[PDB]
């Protein structure tokens, strides 16, 4: 027998370039979030960046 | 006929004392969350109350 077979089995978002916002609101690991916050006007925090 | 019949339907929780610690997390109408959440310190928040 000789034959072929598709195969398509890649992430549902192959195709595009993604930007994601990222606020960064998840576990990560000794830092590197990457997340899209910041703290642009040196208050420290305590409130929506 | 006679005959009777038991009726049990009420809140589950009906035999207790119930406290919650109800910070206040829930969209009100003109305030009267009735939350337990306070900026005892006076620092106006920005941050866990």
């Known amino acids: 027998s000789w034959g072929q077979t598709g195969n398509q089995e890649i992430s549902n978002l192959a195709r595009y370039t993604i930007y994601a916002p990222n606020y960064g609101t998840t576990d990560s690991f000794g830092g590197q979030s990457y997340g ?5 006007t040196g208050s420290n925090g ?4």
């Open 36 to 40: 899209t916050a910041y703290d642009i």
């Open 46 to 49: 305590g409130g929506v960046l």
